[PDB]
Design a protein around this ligand. Structure first.
Ligand SMILES: CCCCCCCCCCCC(=O)OC[C@H](COP(=O)(O)OCC[N+](C)(C)C)OC(=O)CCCCCCCCCCC
Ligand SMILES: CCCCCCCCCCCC(=O)OC[C@H](COP(=O)(O)OCC[N+](C)(C)C)OC(=O)CCCCCCCCCCC
Ligand SMILES: CCCCCCCCCCCC(=O)OC[C@H](COP(=O)(O)OCC[N+](C)(C)C)OC(=O)CCCCCCCCCCC
Ligand SMILES: CCCCCCCCCCCC(=O)OC[C@H](COP(=O)(O)OCC[N+](C)(C)C)OC(=O)CCCCCCCCCCC
Ligand SMILES: CCCCCCCCCCCC(=O)OC[C@H](COP(=O)(O)OCC[N+](C)(C)C)OC(=O)CCCCCCCCCCC
Ligand SMILES: [Br-]
Ligand SMILES: [Br-]
Ligand SMILES: [Br-]
Ligand SMILES: [Br-]
Ligand SMILES: [Br-]
Ligand SMILES: [Br-]
Ligand SMILES: [Br-]
Ligand SMILES: [Br-]
Ligand SMILES: [Br-]
Ligand SMILES: [Br-]
Ligand SMILES: [Br-]
Ligand SMILES: [Br-]
Ligand code: NA
Ligand code: NA
Ligand code: NA
Ligand code: NA
Ligand code: NA
Ligand code: NA
Lengths: 311, 311, 311, 311, 311
């Protein structure tokens, strides 16, 4: 089999569509997601044209091997898609309608800057390489782009599934390649991070601040050091759900900043004890009383600054 | 091969059945389960009619490639099922009896609201897409729906395996689709959560309340902070067995509430010490004595309220 | 190809054997094990009989596609076995000797009641479904059942590999089914649990009891709470190696009971301090002295009771 | 099919190229990375030469089975590559242009000496074994070596993808072998290690040094022992992200050295308490005051020495 | 195809060789390793003999399906090897030279008694089964046994790769089987265990011994209990890298013994406090002073005894 020959010098237009059936396994660390969908293809092959009257049929059904089919691939996949051809239908004028159901693991970078209050644009890049006898270009049939209502991505809200209609045409190894960008817009369900990580982390921090109403150095050391260790556990927990980024994430920034608050609280606890031992408690009392206001105030202002820089 | 021709104008009815052999790997985080079952299919293909006198045999056995077989798929699977055809029996009128044994990983959403005292309805959706020559519709042969007595799903009780007899017929990408809903009702075996998570979590909480019978601030700080950290470990343990939900689970609610009890216990311990240092122990004694009753009472009432909201 | 025809009205007897080459990956949580073995099959096919002096050959070697082979499956497998046919030998009378080497992941429930001092009976269920032409029944050739001397299952002792000679013949979806039960008896190597979990857990518990020879409340709180937290770590460690069970395991029972001992030790430490503060140390001394005997005595008796209920 | 015959006695030159489409899963522990790329091959086959004037065709397209194709393999792969032939084009002089898209898991050793400030040279070794008829040699077509602009390896910066043009020709099992070295130069994005591991580890260490401004032995023991345990947690965390090396890594060296600082701080805290108890606090005061300078100074100098030895 | 006929009554000798290309994934817990190698086979088939003059060829190449090839298997593999035939060359006398490249996951038991200072002998068992026509026997062509210089097994040193030249011929399922033992001798790179596990474990133990220079019970309890808990963390860490063994490993023995040292240190700390409270400090002083010598001395001697029993 060979590609449909051009009537003039035109590139062959392959109309595409992706209909999402299942979305699952969005892996943050790996920056992948799994997809199960219909891939539809359509193109004109004049050599396949027929007269409905003469043939006694209005449609012709072929097997993939019987006819020419464009070699369509995904750019951003781990391995080649697992595909099963569902149908191939030819209209009297040689308009081919191809339908396959496929499953694939897609590589798509994620921006963790606003984590866990982040939104992402996942991409599925469709591609075709031109042949010596014909230049092949891709198009989007909007009537064949969509998603099942039941499509759910655990821990995420699905906003939209659209295609950038104009392909990105470029030369790769002296041949034309035509690339389409299918975009799946999602927003993270931040809900669970509040009772599981955010609030517990704030509670232990506020517990460290009770040391500002205590003259007991031994109890203070216990309050600040114990809560710091629990903060380390939360830091470790958070970093296990995320890849290593060359930038600070919102949560990462708060987690990092909280260490500074623990460090300064230890200085205060030390300074207070030192002065007490040196028979200067009036002074220690001034530092401790100031700390009761300064710590929550600087914490609130630093958080307003951070939220402003990130959102 | 092409579909069987209609005698009048009716759609082709494909009778289905699923007989469960094995159920395993119900993954809560992934919201999947693995299944090993028999899939039975039955349809009339008059082009396969034969005379037992001429052919010698009363029933014909065919290889899948030799005849037309409806392209039946599962909607909610990760990858296409691993199937092995067991038998294809054709009777004189052309009635085909198809039997395959398959294994598949099924995507089925789980409601964790009542976890670990939750029940689920797992779904296996059978589907067929219509062809141009003719419309294909699915039906349930109740005599061919069931499960092996030995079918066990580790950590769950299997209640029932039934099929919604009426298919959901709908248009998808300018063609008819016929969908059947097979339902596997299960209930979680909550037993182990009691000695492993619930009771240990209650013991550490009650241990923190011994601080209400102590005037030693340093010991109190140790009691409340240490048990809080152990509570964080249980919170982390619980959250590793669950996906992130956009709602509160029953266990999550109790776990979250317990933090408030630890936070208020630290306030009480702080207030008590502060008053004792300020030479007001009579007052501190009133707060501590009230706390001995208030903490278990408010804990019991808050739990009754939570159990009521969730069950 | 069709099944061999009956001389009278007899079912076709397929003689079976399983010879274990490798046993590996007994996964307690998943309740699975992997197996690599020979599967031998034997049946009479008269259509294949030949003269030994006329043919020249005493035995004829066939390719699987050339002859009829019974469709033998395993009931309790995750996916269909990976099989490679080794040899097919036909004797003059038409006795077929089939041999394949296969690998499979087997689902077999485990009884954790006596863990880690438990024994298990792993099952490999062989099955055949009858055809319209004739009923197929399974038999065990004991000469062809066995295991390689080098077969080792890490963490287990292999006791025996035997087959229940009488098949379970039953109707399933209007056809006969013939099931054989191959049993692999194993006993857990409990050795490592003693220096790694049992003894460390006992050492920390005995360390908590040193609080009965101390009047220092602050030190006592540290002894009992610290050791309790270490006990929680062991509880978590143990539960990660096990699935969730709707019953108590032996280790689970001991682990759970030890919490009660920590809880009562905290009460004792609290009561002791309270009395000391109330200027009643003589009394506190009576409770502490009684505790020195009561705690180890009740611990020993409770363990004798538990060992009796479980063994 | 057989290899193209030599005109004289020359070896057959197979021109190669690798164009990277996707780079993912650089696993430090496993010392592997996954790759999705184009593999291009070119060689002259005179048996395939044709006349362009009479044929009217400038190029002929063949299926892999129709013609002789060199058996090109990767040396350092886990399993054989998953390949899909994209195109085979023959020019009138018989020059064959082969293109496949493949995916593979590549074994490539990593040097962790400077971790997490390390750079690596990943290798993809292309190989061909000579046939009895003729010797096959590999060459690099630089025009067909490259990478997609969007190629991202999570946690790494991609510097260059080049090929060592001169193959390594050698005898292996009495035949010639022709090996090409494709090099992917990468540098680790160390950013996240600073707020997540380095700084937290330094904060806890500096917190242990507050014990040099405290006479409270009980508080000092708590400060040094608690932070030491947090240091053990960071040591464990770091070692989980790395394989075991027969050399010290930069981070490993710092982590190890920090233990010595904790050990000496415990000695100091012990010596200080001992002297205080022995009624020699003036002396203890001299040791403690010296420690306030000595500990940060020796820490800075030891780090300068280490950075010098490693960079 | 059938086996080559015997000239007299001799067995068919299949000469074998294994050339290691890659060694990776030595999994201690699973007792497996992955291998990528060349498998070479050689035997005489008279039926394929030719005259060089009338043929015009010195060697003849065949496709695996065209000729008889011995069914060679590996005994100790998880699944059947993934193989790709590289070459099949036939010389005039009909001597066949077969070469395949394969990858396999090999089961090979490990002796952990001296861990992490252990050495292992990994085995790759080659096997062939005899046929009714003739007995097939294996031999080693030493010229075709070897390994690539670049073969590295992460965390191990490769010593040698040799074959036991004499096969083990025995009957299995009424056919003779010819087994060859290929041995890969390796020694563990213990280096990293020293700064990561051994030394940290010794440092915390020595820190517990500072309690012998302290009269503070509260501080002593903190020193001994805290370090004990850190020892439990190291015990857990070590046991995660190892399978459960029915014997004590060298590291396991040291780890277990260290618990006894912690237990006795708690007794000493308790006894010391008890005597001090009972107004007998002179005595407590004698026990504490003796402990300062006894603990390190008994620790050194117990370690010499253990090293002697294990090495
Ligand atoms: C420690 C500090 C506590 C964390 C503060 C919340 C983070 C935040 O401020 O989050 C903000 C996001 C909203 O994001 P948005 O509108 O999607 O972003 C796009 C914004 N632009 C386009 C304007 C730039 O979430 C919320 O609705 C906050 C609800 C969570 C409350 C948690 C309380 C604990
Ligand atoms: C910490 C607070 C303790 C937790 C309270 C138990 C939860 C509960 O009350 O659980 C209730 C569930 C029963 O649920 P059901 O009949 O399946 O639900 C459907 C109910 N409708 C249809 C009426 C709405 O389990 C039990 O039988 C309780 C036994 C566990 C006791 C745990 C002791 C600790
Ligand atoms: C904490 C309490 C300590 C644990 C007590 C040992 C458990 C036990 O009693 O274990 C019992 C099993 C023996 O089992 P069996 O004969 O196979 O059982 C079948 C018995 N029937 C058929 C009679 C019912 O192990 C042993 O040989 C015990 C040796 C380990 C001692 C561990 C010391 C710590
Ligand atoms: C705890 C001690 C603090 C760690 C010190 C930083 C390590 C270092 O000095 O890292 C050095 C590397 C740069 O390395 P380079 O140029 O790639 O190496 C090749 C060099 N030759 C060719 C000259 C040999 O990273 C940096 O840019 C350092 C920035 C991180 C600061 C960390 C703050 C905490
Ligand atoms: C806690 C106590 C410290 C551990 C003692 C070292 C273990 C040992 O003694 O290790 C011994 C092995 C050497 O063994 P070999 O020659 O391979 O064995 C075969 C021996 N035969 C044939 C004679 C029986 O390693 C070494 O080179 C020791 C270097 C490690 C130093 C540890 C620093 C801490
Ligand atoms: Br693809
Ligand atoms: Br082009
Ligand atoms: Br103080
Ligand atoms: Br399917
Ligand atoms: Br107090
Ligand atoms: Br099977
Ligand atoms: Br007290
Ligand atoms: Br390859
Ligand atoms: Br002191
Ligand atoms: Br094999
Ligand atoms: Br034999
Ligand atoms: Br004391
Ligand atoms: Na085609
Ligand atoms: Na068909
Ligand atoms: Na067959
Ligand atoms: Na304390
Ligand atoms: Na070819
Ligand atoms: Na063959």
């Amino acid at each position: 089999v060979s590609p449909p020959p051009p009537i003039a010098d035109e590139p062959l237009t392959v109309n595409t569509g992706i209909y999402l059936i299942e979305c699952y396994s969005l892996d943050d660390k790996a920056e992948t997601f799994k997809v199960n969908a219909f891939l539809s293809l359509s193109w004109k092959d004049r050599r396949l044209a027929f007269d409905p009257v003469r043939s006694g049929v209005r449609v012709k059904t072929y097997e993939p091997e019987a006819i020419w089919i464009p070699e369509i691939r995904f750019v951003n996949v781990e391995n080649a898609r697992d595909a099963d051809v569902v149908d191939i239908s030819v209209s009297p004028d040689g308009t081919v309608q191809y339908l396959e159901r496929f499953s694939a693991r897609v590589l798509s970078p994620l921006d963790f800057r606003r984590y866990p209050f982040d939104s992402q644009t996942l991409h599925i890049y469709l591609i075709v390489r031109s042949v010596d006898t014909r230049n092949i270009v891709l198009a989007v049939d909007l009537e064949k782009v969509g998603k099942n209502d039941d499509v759910f991505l655990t821990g995420w809200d699905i906003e939209s599934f659209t295609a950038v209609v104009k392909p990105a045409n470029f030369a790769l190894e002296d041949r034309l390649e035509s690339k389409l960008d299918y975009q799946l817009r999602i927003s993270r369900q931040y809900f669970s991070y509040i009772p599981n990580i955010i609030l517990p982390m704030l509670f232990i921090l506020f517990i460290s601040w009770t040391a500002f109403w205590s003259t007991s150095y031994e109890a203070n050391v216990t309050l600040v050091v114990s809560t710091l260790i629990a903060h380390i556990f939360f830091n470790i927990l958070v970093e296990t759900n995320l890849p290593k980024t060359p930038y600070m994430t919102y949560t990462g920034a708060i987690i990092f900043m909280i260490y500074l608050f623990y460090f300064v609280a230890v200085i205060e606890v030390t300074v207070q004890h030192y002065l007490k031992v040196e028979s200067q408690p009036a002074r220690a009392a001034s530092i401790t009383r100031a700390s009761r206001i300064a710590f929550p105030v600087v914490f609130l202002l630093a958080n307003i600054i951070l939220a402003f820089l990130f959102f």
